[PDB]
Each structure stands twice: as structure tokens, then as C-alpha cells.
Design a protein around this ligand. Sequence first.
Ligand SMILES: [Ca+2]
Ligand SMILES: [Ca+2]
Length: 319
Amino acid sequence: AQVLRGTVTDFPGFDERADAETLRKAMKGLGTDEESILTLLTSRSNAQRQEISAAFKTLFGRDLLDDLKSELTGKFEKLIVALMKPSRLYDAYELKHALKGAGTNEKVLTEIIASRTPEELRAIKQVYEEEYGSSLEDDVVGDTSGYYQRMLVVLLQANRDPDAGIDEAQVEQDAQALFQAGELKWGTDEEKFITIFGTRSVSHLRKVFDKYMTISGFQIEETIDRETSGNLEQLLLAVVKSIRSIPAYLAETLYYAMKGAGTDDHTLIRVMVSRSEIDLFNIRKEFRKNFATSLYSMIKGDTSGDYKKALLLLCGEDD
Ligand SMILES: [Ca+2]
Ligand SMILES: [Ca+2]
């Protein structure tokens, strides 16, 4: 399919001492030059941002991060601070920040654990432990319940079959189980639908989604309802949608985060930063295709200020 790319890449002919001085010049004295800051950081890669941060410290004896936290304000500050976080630690940080006793944010839990590949989930599990000194499963387990928690664990095991010629018997039989499960409202034999959804391979599972509607008339997603359903049905839907296309799922997330009154700035920030160098371009295409409107335009009509200016640049084009 389309090759996978972000909207941010290495700045060619990058100078971390020159960068560091531009940034210093933009904060030194009363006031701030927010346009210099947002225009520089937005067109430097995460790796480069970290390099500048280091040149900052060596040529001025100050911490780049703190200076930005005292110079900057609001949603704008939140966006730049996110941009500066090492890409290796970003996903674990967000997981960690969501797991909070009874205040736990399941939406974030669902969204990162359902759209990340095994390779990515394994790395997040290594990093999390290193940083917060505890394993991710234990924290998930301690702050979640029911088959929701059980399915989070199966997926965290980052262990789903590799692709191979499909076994067409297994597909019909597997489409059958899921049909019945839907009928009984996803609240019986969880152990059975759970092994199917988190262990079968992506190609096998795309065949199954196909058999299911032949053998049922509607698409799996129509048996779940993304507004009222529980934790578990919400996970089931994210999983089905991410199987079909990660960029299509992240594009929908961005859409419901702006769609309406206000904006879910947290969600908009978390998806734009995190995917800027992976698939933001692809998310842009799906978005446009599926919502009949460019992402660039929705952001432009939902945000304002330097917050808006930096997000339009990360977006980096009108589709
Ligand atoms: Ca200043
Ligand atoms: Ca809105």
C-alpha cells in the first residue's frame, strides 16, 4: 500500500549551535518572539530538538526546557513541551499519566494499546519500567477491571501470529464465533472472542471481518456502537478499526476530538506529536477521504494563536 510517512523529517544543513542561539535570542529580555520558536521547533526532527537542547545547555548554562516553561503559556506551552519530549519516552509517558487510581483515563489506554504494533508495544514496555520502575501490566491490572482489563493484558503480551497463507476453514469457523458473540452482546465466552481479536494475524483477521458480514449482513462495527457501549466494547471497536488501518483509526480519533463544540486539546496534541514522524501524512489522506475535509482546515477552524500556527505547520499542508 502507500508507504508510511510523517510530516516531519530532518532539517538538512542543521546547526545545533545556530539553533540554540536563535532560541536564546527569542526569549532573552522582556517578552518573547513566539513565531521564531514555533517556526524552528516545528521543522526540526525530534532527534534534532534534543541536540539543540544540548547545545543550549553547553553554550548558555541554562535548561532549554525550563526557559520555554517560563516564557510560554497555555495550550501553546503544552504543545511545545510535548514536541520536546524524546520520542522514545512519549507513549510510555502518556500511558503512565493516564493510570491514576480511580481517575484512570481508559480512552488513552485503549487508543495507545489498540493502535500500536507489537514492535512498538514491546519497546514502550521496556521504557516504562526503566522510567517508572514498575511493569505496565501490573499498573493496567491494578487500575482496570473485567474482560477490559483481560483484553488489555492479552494485547500487552505483544504476541500476535505473523502473516501466512490463510487457513480458510479457521476463517469461517472464526467468523462464526464472533457472530454468535455479537448476538449475545459481547458478554459471554469472552475468553473465546478475546483470543481471536488479540492473537490471530492482521491478514487473517481482515478475512474474518469479511466472512462475518457475508454470514451476517452488516459489518462487525455495527454491532458495537461508539457512544454508550463499555470499556470492552470501546476496545473491541478500536481493535477492529486499527486492524483495518491504523491511519484510518487515528484520523477518526482526531475528527471526534474537534468535531463539535470545543476541542479535546489533549487528544489533538497527543496524536499530532506522536505520529508526526510515522504516519501523519497517511492519517491526513484517510481523514480527507473519510470526512470530506482536510485536517488542516478543521484544526484551523478549531484553534487559534501560536497554538494554531504550530499545529498547521505540523500538519504541513492543505489536502
Ligand atoms: Ca523573555
Ligand atoms: Ca470543535
